């Protein structure tokens, strides 16, 4: 898969397990079209979101459902979701890892891009 | 000043100056509607975005135009922007500071809610 | 005020109040020697740590007692402290703000150097 | 190995390759005793630092050589090194991943602890 998402929990020191991740791709009419979705595993990783054939160039938005995650842990979350927006494959196909580190009132995200 | 935005640059260790910031409030039809906007000052701060009367409870999105900031510096960015989506709840006297720390391929955001 | 320390809490979305901060300067015998210290205020800030005359170029270490902070809140922490080690270089008029964002199993630190 | 270190570069969007990592363990006389060391691989990971037999309870300090990393990339670093200090195995053996995300004037670190 050319697009992996990894999510970590900064409160418990663990991977963020069973976190819903939605990926959208910007359409011609400037609206967000559903592209792919899934849940993080026991390792906090989400593999198999897409394939090389489906992952075309475009502007993508990765929405991480942090609200449900904190609510299920009984913690009061600030953010509705963690939203990462970027242009992908504009200079040819690349592999992307989008990582996110979550806290109730803060999040950090980084990207690892390889050719 | 119930809502302030502060933006910092992790590459040069400075405030991020003249960065466009747009604030949206979630409408009844599940759409993002413009609420406030401005450009960060020499201190990387954006004050006077809204008034106590205008800033009601609801779901807000703060979009920071980080792509334009890195491009002006001649540094290649990954993200289109940094978007912070959160619920604003009236739970006593509160002031919100949304702070973002930027790098070309990463960003962190936090909220500081004070009385 | 050539050196300021600001500490934020990512769990409760607030300044981190009454946190002990110790500043050390690297000696000629490669040892860490005490330089300044204090406790963060109600705003999570610690001002008046040093004077322009005292704050010379060199290698500094800022140690934030995060373990005592989380323990007082009844939250289990991972780190003993958060230590920020950096070189202070005179390159025109400069003020250093060392900011730290804390979670029980994570921390982020940045420096804001302003003229 | 019960202790893994992963390091990422927030400027280039890549793993931080060939970064020196030194691990110390606090001795009875309050001094830092060398414990283990190594360099991150092409994936930014450092495996095989230690073994279950050698990794006893104690206070450990993981020092990441960020200064050499930025200097070799021709970037001006602020920090001398990224220092992560924590008590390990105090309630029995655990597996620890210490991750760090690097920028020239900032770093973030988190821990993933598993039983
Ligand atoms: O309210 C202020 O003046 C003020 C100052 C310094 C600040 N630093 C931050 C900050 C630091 C890190 Cl390490 C990560 C993140 Cl996400 C944010 O938020 C701030 C606010
Ligand atoms: O254990 C792994 O393989 C692995 C992978 C990707 C990872 N990304 C991070 C990371 C991300 C952010 Cl946004 C902030 C911080 Cl402090 C750390 O930790 C990781 C670990």
> SS3 letters for chain B?
CCEEEEEEECCCCEECCCCEEEEEEECCCCCEEEEEEEECCCCCEECCCCCCCCCCCEEEEEEECHHHHHHHHCCCCCEEEEEEEEEECCCCCCEEEEEEEEECCEEEEEEEEEC
DSSP letter at C73 equals H
In 3D, which of A21, A16, A86 has the Cα closest to residue A57?
Answer: A86
Cβ(A113)–Cβ(A94) below 8 Å: yes
> What resolution in angstroms, rounded to 1 decimal?
1.8
Has B45 been labeled as part of a binding site?
A: yes
Can you tell me which residue has the tokens 């006893």?
D56
Helix extents (H) in C1-115: 66-73
Question: Which tokens is D111 given?
Answer: 């821990």
In 3D, which of A69, A64, A70 has the Cα closest to residue A22?
Answer: A64
C38 Cα: distance to centroid of ligand 2 (angstroms): 32
* B-C contacts (CB, under 8 Å): 35
Feature table: binding site of A for L-thyroxine: 6, 45, 108
Cβ(C88)–Cβ(C68) below 8 Å: no
Would you list the domain boundaries of chain A?
1-115
- Rounded to the nearest 5 percent, the helix, strand and coil shares of chain A are 5, 55, 40
A99 Cα: distance to centroid of ligand 2 (angstroms): 6
Sequence-ordered list of residues with C-beta below 8 angstroms from that of A91, at least 6 positions apart, any chain: none
**SS3 (DSSP) at D61:** strand
- State the CB neighbour count (10 A cutoff) for residue A114: 12
Cβ(D81)–Cβ(D63) below 8 Å: yes
Mark yes or no for CB contact A11/C105 under 8 Å.
yes
Mark yes or no for CB contact C13/A105 under 8 Å.
yes
Helix extents (H) in C23-113: 66-73
B15 close contact with C: CB closer than 8 A: yes
What per-residue string of b and e applies to C39-57 under the rule 16 or more CB within 10 Å gives b?
ebeeebbbeebbeeeebee
Cβ(A8)–Cβ(A103) below 8 Å: no
Protein residue with its CA nearest to atom 18 in ligand 2? D99
Of A59, A81, A86, the CB nearest to B85: A81
Question: Which tokens is A40 given?
Answer: 């993080």
d(CA D48, CA D37): 9
Can you tell me which residue has the tokens 């007692």?
C65
Regarding the beta carbon of B97 and ligand 1, being less than 6 Å apart is answered yes
In 3D, which of C22, A45, A16, C97 has the Cα closest to residue B8?
Answer: C97
**SS3 (DSSP) at C60:** strand
């Amino acid at each position: 898969c050319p697009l992996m998402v990894k999510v970590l929990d900064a409160v418990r020191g663990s991977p963020a397990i069973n976190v819903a991740v939605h990926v959208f791709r910007k359409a011609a009419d400037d609206t967000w079209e559903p592209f792919a979705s899934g849940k993080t595993s026991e390792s906090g990783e989400l593999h198999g979101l897409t394939t090389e054939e489906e992952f075309v160039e475009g502007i993508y938005k990765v929405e991480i459902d942090t609200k449900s995650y904190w609510k299920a842990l009984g913690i009061s979350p600030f953010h509705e979701h963690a939203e990462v927006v970027f242009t992908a494959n504009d200079s040819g196909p690349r592999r992307y890892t989008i990582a996110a580190l979550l806290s109730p009132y803060s999040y950090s995200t980084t990207a690892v891009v390889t050719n």
